[PDB]
Amino acid sequence: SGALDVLQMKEEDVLKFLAAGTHLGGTNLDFQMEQYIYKRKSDGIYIINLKRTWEKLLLAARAIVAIENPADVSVISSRNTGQRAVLKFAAATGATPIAGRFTPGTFTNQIQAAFREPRLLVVTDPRADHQPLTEASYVNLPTIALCNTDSPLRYVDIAIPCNNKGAHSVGLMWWMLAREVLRMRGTISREHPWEVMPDLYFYRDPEE
Template identity: 30%
Template sequence: MSEQTESTDIKKKILSTGIRVGTPVKTKFMTPFITKASPEGLYMLDIDITLEKIKIAAKFINRLGTDKLIVCSARQYANTPIEKFCEMLGSKKLLGRFMPGTLTNPSLPYYIEPKLVLISDPQVDVQAITEATNAGIPVIGISNTDNITSKLDVIIPANNRGRKALATVYWLLVRQILIERGELKEDEPMKYEIDDFETKITEEEIE
């Protein structure tokens, strides 16, 4: 299968996941990644740029090593995607509140020295970004239309609020990392599908 048809297939597969649906707000940082506004007034992200940025992020992660990466998010919907990502790639996860000093205070028992940090939302994960920046650690961030991304080294423009969208971004990233490593062919199915990466909500949460 040629790369062209492959990328078309992937695009078809992910368009229904809401990955490119932004918010009613756009920042100057995210303007280059926005194509148009939807009839409902939501800014839409350019899916081609998203896929391109996922390739760049995958190369970057592979260069430094997935075992040197920490993936953090205080956003609940990112929990399952991050758990699956770390399970498949051997990265370290930090879910929930980011403890101050994690990257900057060597005297703390939970202090770590990663080579790279991946965050799910620049707004929610601001503590992780600040500490990584102070420690000179590069940051890859999944960013929506309303995010401020001045401290990020690689921006993955995507909907970082939706369950399905977050699952899709992490799924695409794992897939691309495995392809870059030569462990997965472009047209080969992965062990997990996007659904497996999705945080399931319980009935109590729906009510």
């Protein structure tokens, strides 16, 4: 990766990726998502490479580190699956969540009381949260998000591929994201098991 094997993907994490079905990706493709895919099966389903997922995780996370204030890396998700995941993210690591409906004009107003000026964004799924992306390009925000095979790239600077159609793929990926930023900034580093797990970043899932 960069450093020889003290940042490179371990044998452990491979099991978690495959158990959460992150490697699988939808039938439809884009021409900006061609390189991330390796190939197709004998059936409609296209298998994302996990090596290529891993490199994109790192500089994405390293950019979340690079800011000197952790209270203005505003995360956003509006899908139900991505509500519980982001809430733990921005609770654990200093960040600002915007859960549910966006309520437009919150990055360009001077009258609204939910007005904020962050630096980064971390979005789940471009085609549920298209609204904050358009407003990001009016006030110079860097942008990161989780793309799928059929999610187009536009007003995003870096992608973090994932299966993310509402799965354990979602919560696992947000957990891993918060794990990495702590290895560089925090004192959680040792790279041997963290107390917090991905078993509460997964969906609410209506119970009995």
